[PDB]
Design a protein. Sequence first.
Lengths: 245, 14
Amino acid sequence: IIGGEFTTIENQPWFAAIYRRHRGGSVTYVCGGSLISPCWVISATHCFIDYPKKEDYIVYLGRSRLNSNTQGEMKFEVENLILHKDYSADTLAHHNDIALLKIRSKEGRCAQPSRTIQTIALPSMYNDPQFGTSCEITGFGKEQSTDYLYPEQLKMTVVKLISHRECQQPHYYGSEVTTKMLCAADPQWKTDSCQGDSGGPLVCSLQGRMTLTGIVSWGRGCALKDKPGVYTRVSHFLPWIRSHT
Amino acid sequence: GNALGRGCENHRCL
């Protein structure tokens, strides 16, 4: 997250931190995710496509820090890694960028809700907030493009949803952004998601309910003028999510 | 991998 605010997991209790174990025992951070039911975390296919081996991955819930323990945190393995069959990537745009991770503890249990671990509501069909709506994003991704390490503390920021018409302008993304994608950015281009935030939530208060409207997917650079963050439009994928869970 | 932005996390060269 470029700019924005340091946060803690109680403020973002659906947030899932996903890491990959390497041969030799080193563990690196991959991407964010969101808990949509006790056994299911939703993320982005692009985070796993090149290493699609579910045994490699560790998922934490209730975690506020990248490489230290948070009280109440819970550690999981991936029982099922489900990537979208029609995923593809162009030069900038990623398509069908959505993935589900069925999580289980070493004892075979799913998440136990607490003050720091909660599910986030899915949106209803064809129901997204109006452009101009302010929504939040959360993640452990880069704070500046010159960063070679991720921040140790979780971050969040607030961005505004941008219309499809605006996002398809020639100086934005033209026809590379589709109706299955949502653009969001800061009017001053000072805050944005960045590399490492992918897979994480774009949450909007929708009819008084905190809703998983988007999943961090792609964008040109980070907090670059006329280059919004692009998010998987979760509301388009409800049948896929329902069939695979 | 590559450090070319959102979309490119955890990628493999070749």
